[PDB]
Write a protein that binds this ligand. Structure first.
Ligand SMILES: *[C@@H]1O[C@H](CO[C@@H]2O[C@@H](C)[C@@H](O)[C@@H](O)[C@@H]2O)[C@@H](O)[C@H](O)[C@H]1NC(C)=O
Ligand SMILES: *[C@@H]1O[C@H](CO)[C@@H](O)[C@H](O)[C@H]1NC(C)=O
Ligand SMILES: *[C@@H]1O[C@H](CO)[C@@H](O)[C@H](O)[C@H]1NC(C)=O
Lengths: 160, 106, 50, 160, 160
């Protein structure tokens, strides 16, 4: 589940260590996610460019066949737009939710890649360090700069 | 050993996709109807008005050969055969015939 | 015939509820849309690879 | 390839151990897959809500331009629906097949997560246990309750 | 980033070892990717099957309402096709790019599966062998036949 206490972006990290605890949004991921979503929503709206029209038409009592043709035209257009719009919404909502799931999955893998054998994969997005990992260490991991070799000795000594 | 797998069967049903063609799948449905029952039915609970060998002009004017047709009190649609030749018998212009046909359709 | 439908074509009534039909373009009723396609087969299952 | 002998659901497991062998559907996965597919098929059909119409129109010999307009209307609607329907089917069939592939992929990962270093990943969806794993053990793995620590000693002793 | 020097297919490998270096396309992957793309492009074009039509219609000055109906018909069809076409292109371009990303991701995993503990995952699609892996060894890996057990002794000796 998500963090109702994390309101500075869509995705982010929470930590607990010897020196303290808290959370922060991962704004590289969140901003990319935002640009993705923003472009998507705008394309849905911005591409549907209409012109000035006048829909209503008037016919007399001896023109029933023409009025009915006009109705036929309105009905076909109405069914097409209503149906396509429902499918577009349903399809995009599933894709949107998968996109979001992708972005957070990517962050997990980036962290795992840096930590390698110096942390346990436990669950709830958590990596349990096998060595002391203080605030400097955790910021280094979040920023993509974890210097794995300097922590590998401690990680194995705490397991041997 | 523990193995994760999936269902397979004797289905020969294939579908096409955007990347590949003739893919056999285990379960499949149509979105397309290609069957009908071969009958003209009551539409929404009301019987059609069948005119036999007469067309609407024949029926409404009273062509002598349309005398055998029954009078419907109501109808959902009108049915004429491709051979509905008995119409106007005294030649002339039936004015606004198409509008009359539309008004009497239901 | 003494039968009842929701959609009627000249070749006979349509009994059914799928979104498209390829029976006839001229219909009366709450009809499926006519298409030129001969097959709109939507998979529900997985690839049948034994 | 799939199991032609497994007809109690779309996805499931097969095993062989000292106490016996056989297979069973994973009904958590299969039912979720079913609800997904059912909702998808129903949305495709259930959203296309039409009204009562009458398509045919009649024109005389001095109304050729109107009859031709009526044809133009029928043809445009026909091309739109035929084309969109073909794309919808082709697109959804690919998405359907990916969805199914996703659900079974997810089951593999859940098992791998529980087994960790107590089984070898060999292929054909199989995890070879490095320790005796009897019917109780395998049911525990399938149900998400494998008690990894009680099997880790045996798994390493059979490898050392 | 890609290799501007690799022009014999969309996907492939590059290597460096004691006996030499170079690259080659993975043509199993590339051909499958091509068939996928080819079928996709062709379905987009080949399914939109039109008939012989004549669009223009002529009306006199006392038929303004009919001319306007004709315009209404042209405009509705135009808005539908323009919009759907833009969405189809935008949607497919994203799916196309994901498809390509999938195919190359799959190749990485196939290699990783064969190499297991005999190579380090370093990045830029690279697996660093922990043992001598000459041209015969690398071709064996690319072809799906790496005989892992014959290299595992050397790989551990170079790490112990
Ligand atoms: C797609 O399949 C259609 C049905 O044919 C069946 O599957 C193919 C792959 C062959 O095994 C055939 O013997 C089967 O009956 C074919 O009519 C169609 O031509 C195939 N591809 C196309 C559309 O050309
Ligand atoms: C439609 O036909 C069924 C018999 O199949 C009958 O029971 C039902 O009453 C009919 N409906 C109407 C409106 O006549
Ligand atoms: C045909 O209509 C009857 C109602 O009279 C309904 O019970 C039956 O399921 C329909 N058949 C199909 C194939 O939809």
């Amino acid at each position: 589940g998500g963090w109702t206490g994390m309101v500075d972006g869509w995705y982010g990290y929470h930590h607990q260590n010897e020196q303290g605890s808290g959370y922060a949004a991962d704004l590289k991921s969140t901003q990319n996610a935002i640009d993705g979503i923003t472009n998507k929503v705008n394309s849905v709206i911005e591409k549907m460019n209409t012109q000035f029209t006048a829909v209503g038409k008037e016919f007399n009592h001896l023109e029933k066949r023409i009025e009915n043709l006009n109705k036929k035209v309105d009905d076909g257009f109405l069914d097409i737009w209503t149906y396509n719009a429902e499918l577009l919404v349903l399809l995009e909502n599933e894709r949107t939710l998968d996109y979001h799931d992708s972005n957070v999955k990517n962050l997990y893998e980036k962290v795992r890649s840096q930590l390698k054998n110096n942390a346990k994969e436990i669950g709830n997005g958590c990596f349990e360090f096998y060595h002391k990992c203080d605030n400097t260490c955790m910021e280094s991991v979040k920023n993509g700069t974890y210097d794995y070799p300097k922590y590998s000795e401690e990680a194995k000594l705490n397991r041997e | 050993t523990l193995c994760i797998g999936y269902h397979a069967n004797n289905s020969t049903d294939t579908v096409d996709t955007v990347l590949e063609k003739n893919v056999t799948v285990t379960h499949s449905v149509n979105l397309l109807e290609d069957k009908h029952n071969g009958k003209l039915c009551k539409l929404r609970g009301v019987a059609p008005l069948h005119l036999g060998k007469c067309n609407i002009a024949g029926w409404i004017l009273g062509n002598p050969e349309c005398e055998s047709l029954s009078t419907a009190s109501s109808w959902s649609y009108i049915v004429e055969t491709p051979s509905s030749d008995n119409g106007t018998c005294y030649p002339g212009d039936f004015i606004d015939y198409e509008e009359l046909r539309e008004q009497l359709s239901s | 015939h003494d039968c009842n439908t929701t959609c009627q074509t000249p070749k006979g009534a349509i009994n059914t509820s799928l979104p498209f039909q390829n029976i006839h373009p001229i219909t009366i009723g709450k009809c499926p849309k006519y298409v030129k396609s001969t097959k709109l087969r939507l998979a529900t299952g997985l690839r049948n690879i034994p």
